Curated annotation (Swiss-Prot), chain B:
Name assigned to this protein: Multiple antibiotic resistance protein MarR
SUPFAM superfamilies: Winged helix' DNA-binding domain (SSF46785)
BP GO annotations: cellular response to antibiotic; negative regulation of DNA-templated transcription; regulation of DNA-templated transcription; response to heat; response to stress
Chain coiled-coil ranges: none
GO function terms (MF aspect): DNA binding; DNA-binding transcription factor activity
Residue ranges constituting the HTH marR-type domain according to the UniProt record: 5-134
Gene that encodes the chain: marR
Result of changing V39E: Increased transcription of the region II transcript
Species of origin: Escherichia coli (strain K12)
Amino acid sequence: DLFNEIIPLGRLIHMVNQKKDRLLNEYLSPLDITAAQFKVLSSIRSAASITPVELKKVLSVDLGALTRMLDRLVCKGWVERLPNPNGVLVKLTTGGAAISEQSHQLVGQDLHQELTKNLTADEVATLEYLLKKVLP
Amino acid sequence: LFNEIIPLGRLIHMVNQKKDRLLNEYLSPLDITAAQFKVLSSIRSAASITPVELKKVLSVDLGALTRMLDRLVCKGWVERLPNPNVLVKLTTGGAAISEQSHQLVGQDLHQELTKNLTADEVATLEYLLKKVLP
C-alpha cells in the first residue's frame, strides 16, 4: 500500500515514531504511566539532575507544557524540585528511579519484537546501521 | 555509535529528535516552531477536527493542546467553531503559513538528513522504515 508511494524520509520517521509511542503507551499501561511521562523520566534519569530550561531543550516541547508535566510528576512522587548552586534543578526520587527501571524492563523486549516483526535479522541490522548514518 | 548495539526504538527516538531540531532551525525565518508546524499540518490534512481527535492523532496531553490552540488562535492561524453536534480549522493565514512552511523546509531537510547517505542507502532506509509501519 505504502510501497507504491514515494514518501519523504521526514514523514517516515514521524510515522514510525508515532507507532513507537503508541506501542510504548500500550505496553506501559500496566504501570499507570504514559509514553510522555516515561520519556521525561528517562531524560532526567540520564542527566541525573537537570534545568527545566535544559530539559525543555532536550525534549523539544513547550516550556509551559513541561512545567505542568513536572507538576504532575512531582505529585506522583517520582520527581522532586531543588534549588541548585546558582534557578531550579529536577531529579528523580527513589520511586522515580524504580518506576523508570521497571518501566524500561517491562517494555524493551515487547517493543523490539513488535517493531521488527516484518523484518529479517539482516534487514534489522541494515536499518539500524543506516539510521545511525543519519545522526552525524 | 557504530560500535554499540542500539535498540531500534531509541534510534527512531534519536533520529526523530534530530528531525525536530532541523525543523525548528529551518522554520525560524517564519517565526513558527516545529510543534506549531505539526499542529498546523494535522489540522490542514483533516480540514477540521476535534481537539479530542487532534489529541489522539498527535499523542500529547489534552491540556497542552488546548493551550497550544489558544496561542494558534491568537496568532490568527487557527479558529474554533461549533460543529453540528468544538472543531478547529485553519484560517486563510494559517493555510498560507503552513504551505510556505512546507515549501521552505522540505528541500533543506532532505539534504541535511541524507548528507551522509548514498542515494541507494537512502532508498533502502525508506523501504525498511515502511516495513515497520504495518
